[PDB]
Design a protein around this ligand. Structure first.
Ligand SMILES: CO[C@@H](C(=O)N1Cc2[nH]nc(NC(=O)c3ccc(N4CCN(C)CC4)cc3)c2C1)c1ccccc1
Lengths: 88, 264
């Protein structure tokens, strides 16, 4: 569902183009959360507008198991989270 | 907020659409006059334009510029889709052009100035309109230009931009020739628009779409004699076959013909 397109020891390029939405249910913005897999860190987050299909997460630790999660937050719905694990 | 039909007072119909009507409306909380566009879902899915509706709402809802028609929000029930839009009382630039046949240089340069300011705002967000034409332009209370209809718009980093879209007389050549396109297609259609404002007809008009695609691809157009040298210079700079040669909107606003004729 979620896909990592490009890779860099300090940056990742994710894309949620495969995530299909309900008809007449339009997305307002996205909540993208990333952090060390299995850890107890607070997990960093940020938002992009709803018309985005890709996003660039920068400033990460090389050689670290990360968990990328995207929350599609529509104007009248909250879609199920989609995740992916990628090692920088 | 969770908008609904119960939140607006509905008045007379303002105009007609392809899949519904636009009504004059008022938000009961603030008594603020707005425009309510109704779109019947049955007429939408029959035309297969639902994806363009999703594009217009998800993009235009984030654009806040004095020369862009605001989309305050939307909602929908079982049969219709509602768009809460900014009220433009003076109508479309298309009807004003039908009345006056053609615009003078002062009114045209002021329109191009306002349109370039809104496009510079859109391009600053990597948003391309891809459908600039007089039928998509509304006029504000003081006569200011407002760009509407963002169904063909696109977020450049979120698309490959290899599919042809827009209006026949305003299509850029890179689209007809099947090449990847970017923000420069708005610069081409801006030059096509500047020609129609001063002349009254688009430059690549033809009796069939075969010839129009051919005339655009080869940039085959001429100016009437009443077009001043400053206007020909801008249109020629905008109607370049190579998208990289087309100027930046910052330079269009700084062009001597705009500087000497635009009111804004
Ligand atoms: C069909 O969608 C509408 C749309 O979305 N919209 C959103 C929105 N907001 N305000 C609008 N104004 C009018 O529809 C309108 C029509 C005629 C009018 N007059 C006619 C009579 N005159 C004596 C005075 C002026 C004045 C205003 C519209 C249309 C649209 C139409 C054209 C371009 C872009 C969008």
């Amino acid at each position: 569902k979620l896909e990592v397109v490009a890779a860099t020891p300090t940056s990742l390029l994710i894309s949620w183009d495969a995530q299909t939405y309900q008809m007449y249910d339009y997305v307002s913005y996205y909540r993208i959360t990333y952090g060390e897999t299995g850890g107890n860190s607070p997990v960093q987050e940020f938002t992009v507008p709803g018309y985005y299909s890709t996003a660039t997460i920068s400033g990460l630790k090389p050689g670290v198991d990360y968990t990328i999660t995207v929350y599609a937050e529509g104007y009248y719905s909250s879609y199920s989270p989609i995740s992916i694990n990628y090692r920088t | 907020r969770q908008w609904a039909l119960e939140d607006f007072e509905i008045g007379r119909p303002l105009g007609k659409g392809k899949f519904g009507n636009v009504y004059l409306a008022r938000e009961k909380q603030s008594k603020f006059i707005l425009a309510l566009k109704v779109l019947f879902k049955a007429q939408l899915e029959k035309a297969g334009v639902e994806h363009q509706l999703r594009r217009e709402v998800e993009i235009q809802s984030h654009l806040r510029h004095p020369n862009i028609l605001r989309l305050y929000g939307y909602f929908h029930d079982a049969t219709r889709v509602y768009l809460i839009l900014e009220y433009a009382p003076l109508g479309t630039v298309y009807r004003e052009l039908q009345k006056l046949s053609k615009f003078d240089e002062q009114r045209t340069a002021t329109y191009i100035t306002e349109l370039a300011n809104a496009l510079s705002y859109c391009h600053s967000k990597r948003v391309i309109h891809r459908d600039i034409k007089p039928e998509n332009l509304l006029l504000g209370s003081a006569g200011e230009l407002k760009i509407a209809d963002f169904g063909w718009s696109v977020h450049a980093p979120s698309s490959r931009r290899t599919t042809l879209c827009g209006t026949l007389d305003y299509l850029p050549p890179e689209m007809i020739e099947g090449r990847m396109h970017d923000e420069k297609v708005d610069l081409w259609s801006l030059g096509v628009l500047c020609y129609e404002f001063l002349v009254g007809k688009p430059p690549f008009e033809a009796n069939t779409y075969q010839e129009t695609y051919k005339r655009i691809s080869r940039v085959e157009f001429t100016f009437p004699d009443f077009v001043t040298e400053g206007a020909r210079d801008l249109i020629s700079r905008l109607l370049k076959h190579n998208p990289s040669q087309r100027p930046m909107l910052r330079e269009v606003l700084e062009h001597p013909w705009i500087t000497a004729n635009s009111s804004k």
